Amino acid sequence: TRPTVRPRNDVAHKQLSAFGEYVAEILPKYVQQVQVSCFSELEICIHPDGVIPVLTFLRDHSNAQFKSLADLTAVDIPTRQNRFEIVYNLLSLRFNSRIRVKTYTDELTPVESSVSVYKAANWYEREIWDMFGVFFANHPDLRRILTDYGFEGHPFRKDFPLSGYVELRYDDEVKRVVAEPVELAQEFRKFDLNSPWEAFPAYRQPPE
């Protein structure tokens, strides 16, 4: 098990375990899960109410700074009543440790202007709103970034296909750029590479 295998270092696993237990004790109110993966980054799964108290606590408090903000995407899965996941990502400048604050939501429940507590989150919030439609409440200015203006449909959803519905060209009748229903020249031959026999027996879900 030793050569050509990325080694674990369970001392960091224990330290982040103690920190996660510390967090679950000091904020009893909005904690459902504090999980630690074997490659040792913290994940904290959160009810969508106290996200602003969580961020105002974990920006500060002098036991865990976490000034550093990173990615936010509300990674869309079906099959749950709450489809979307706000995935905040944080790094402390002083401590070299990465935590992930994942709170859940569905297609209509917002968060409540998290830009006021992290100033980097402005175009991140506007981006997630434009690409998905996850409305973010009481934000100062929502617009559209990374789409066309006349385009609509919130394309990073699963229901939006690989191509779109509009397609542009230049017509010479009215001498301008117009749109059409999309008309491919090749199929996009979709492959079913879901070959059976369970390459990972560690994650076997139970049946009925």
Binding site: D148, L162, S163, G164, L168, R169, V177
Partner: protein, 156 residues
Amino acid sequence: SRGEYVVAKLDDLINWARRSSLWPMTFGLACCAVEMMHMAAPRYDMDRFGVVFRASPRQSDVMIVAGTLTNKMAPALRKVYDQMPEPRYVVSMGSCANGGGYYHYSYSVVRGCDRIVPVDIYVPGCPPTAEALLYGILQLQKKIKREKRLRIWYRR
């Protein structure tokens, strides 16, 4: 047919004049812009040919589309293309631009710049070699050698 001989040499003169200078504008969105500014480098001079980079669209000669043309880009593209003088010639550089290519199956990619402007010279590559782009400019110049505009105006 001394008039026709004068027409032949005069057509030769103006076609030589058109193919000689050819100062373009670099449209240049993505990494094919980096490749254009690498074929303006010391190891491949456009300036051996008199082909000089110039960001002035009111005096551009060949418009080189290069990069991933999008829906959000395209009205600005043809607004650039309209206010270009009537001698205009189009080089589509890169697999993004000459048929969509790698980002073919998505929203917000016009499947090549054929749907926006007419195209004279397709040159492929992702990225093309700078040396290959220079060769594409040479074959465009041979197209400019083959114009017979003044002959067609003489016998129209």
